[PDB]
Ligand binder design. Structure first.
Ligand SMILES: CCn1c(NCc2ccco2)nc2ccccc21
Length: 487
């Protein structure tokens, strides 16, 4: 790493200086490092230039705004300081070059939208790896090679991706936040493909409002290397995107493919939601097929079909994707199904707000021939507002509501429960069982063979906070034990 080589595309005159690490933070700036001084949210890194120089940085790249011309090379206390205008916009490219263009050294797939990012990225990484890639994810769980995912500027993004390349990754599925995009955090990434899941941005109901928002997004889009575009045609904004992108792949499970366009497409033609997942028949421009998904709910059919269409688009063979689909797993504690021969279907989900709970119940209902049970509670010593709302949701969208504890902390457990019940039209028909373990047991053992028991609120977590203590407790382990299986 050399300053001169780093800057060659932009500043031909730049001096030659060995560089160690690249950093935005003058505090962490070590000897031999490259300090980048950017202007941000009430904050000017340029004021920390003397600090970093005293900490022994090898060189500095600084925002030229008001202070210098673009590409002006100065020298303070020996150390070269180079000014670039619109540095925030160019940071991703600068960092890309610094870390030897990590997105050119693996297949990077970006997933954006309100919901389904985590699952869709997870499925992409899994499926690609099943087909022989070494796959990684960068998302809100964390970053890492599949199974080794550890829990954030444009530099950090390029640095993390470079780390994954170094660890041997050939494929990376990255969640892309709308916040990230607008702030140029992925501006210079070479995406092999870009997936759009959906949009639940309200405050867009005017055609004076909707227009600046869309215009801003179209512009940004035109500035990114998006690669192959894969778009959910069951979303209204999805169809607007598709109207203007003839090379994009449309994906649908609800009849929104317009085959007149002669584009690439993929649609589910029938889905049977059963007690251990979903059976999905689809047609596509790559040919037809049938998948057994071990994921629950309609949204997860959609996510799976997006992952499939993306991989097909990138040239992974249909036959191999089909042969491997059955090994695709849910994200731990996200509509995670537990079945055992001759027992009720049990689903562990982390849903802990009214919205999430409603979605999880609706999803579970599709798979439920019998009664749908909902085992849940609400956090103690936290905001109380959601309690009666979650109560009303359980009452409406389930047949049996079992109200129990969920991290009651220092608050009286029964007080929390009373707050939940107050939300119901007929609290008297709700079952209350204190001791979360006992409540789960009550549902699992009373439910019929074709009932579905949703156990909501904890998902992957392995603790129940009672008082000051984190006791060892898992919904997954509790369920697994009761059904005579492994978690
Ligand atoms: C990183 C890709 N990306 C997306 N989402 C996925 C998509 C939309 C249309 C096809 O795929 N929306 C964007 C907006 C501006 C820049 C880039 C964007």
């Amino acid at each position: 790493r050399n300053l001169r080589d780093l800057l060659a595309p932009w500043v031909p005159d730049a001096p030659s200086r060995a560089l160690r690490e690249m950093t935005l933070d003058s505090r962490v700036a070590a000897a031999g490092d490259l300090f980048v001084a950017v202007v941000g949210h009430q904050a000017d890194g340029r004021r920390y230039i003397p600090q970093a120089i005293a900490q022994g940085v090898a060189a500095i790249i600084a925002e030229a705004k008001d202070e210098a011309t673009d590409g002006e090379i100065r020298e303070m206390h020996g150390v070269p300081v180079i000014y670039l205008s619109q540095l925030n916009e160019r940071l991703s490219a600068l960092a890309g070059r610094f870390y030897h263009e990590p997105s050119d050294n693996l297949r990077l797939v970006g997933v954006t939208g309100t919901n389904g990012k985590t699952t869709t990225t997870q499925l992409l990484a899994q499926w690609s790896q099943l087909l022989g890639e070494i796959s990684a994810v960068m998302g809100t769980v964390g970053n890492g090679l599949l199974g080794k995912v550890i829990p954030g500027s444009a530099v950090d993004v390029q640095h993390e991706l470079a780390g994954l390349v170094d660890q041997g990754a050939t494929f990376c599925a990255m969640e892309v936040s709308s916040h990230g995009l607008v702030q140029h955090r992925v501006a210079a990434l070479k995406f092999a493909a870009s997936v759009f899941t959906n949009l639940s941005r309200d405050h867009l109901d005017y055609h004076g409002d909707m227009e600046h928002y869309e215009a801003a997004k179209w512009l940004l889009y035109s500035e990114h290397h998006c690669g192959q575009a894969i778009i959910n045609a069951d979303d209204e904004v999805g169809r607007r995107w598709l109207a203007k992108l003839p090379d994009a792949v449309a994906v649908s499970m609800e009849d929104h493919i317009n085959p007149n366009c002669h584009g690439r497409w993929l649609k589910a033609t029938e889905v049977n939601y059963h007690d251990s997942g979903a059976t999905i028949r689809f047609s596509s421009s790559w040919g037809d097929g049938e998948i057994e998904s071990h994921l629950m709910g309609a949204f997860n059919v959609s996510n799976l079909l997006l992952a499939l269409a993306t991989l097909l688009a990138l040239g992974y063979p249909l036959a191999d994707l089909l042969k491997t689909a059955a090994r695709l797993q849910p994200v731990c504690g996200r509509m995670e199904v537990f079945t055992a021969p001759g027992k009720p279907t049990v689903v562990v989900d982390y849903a802990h707000t009214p919205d999430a709970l409603e979605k999880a119940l609706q999803a579970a209902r599709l798979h439920c021939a019998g009664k749908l049970w909902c085992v849940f509670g609400c956090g103690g010593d936290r905001d109380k507002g959601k309690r009666p709302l979650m109560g009303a949701i359980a009452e409406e969208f389930a047949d049996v509501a079992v109200v129990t504890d969920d991290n009651p902390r220092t608050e009286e457990p029964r007080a929390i429960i009373n707050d939940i019940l107050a939300g119901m039209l007929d609290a008297g028909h709700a079952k209350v069982m204190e001791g979360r373990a006992e409540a789960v047991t009550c549902a699992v053992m009373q439910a019929k063979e074709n009932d579905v028991v949703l156990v909501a609120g904890k998902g992957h977590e392995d603790y129940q906070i009672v008082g000051n203590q984190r006791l060892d407790y898992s919904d997954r382990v509790t369920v697994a034990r009761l059904l005579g299986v492994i978690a």
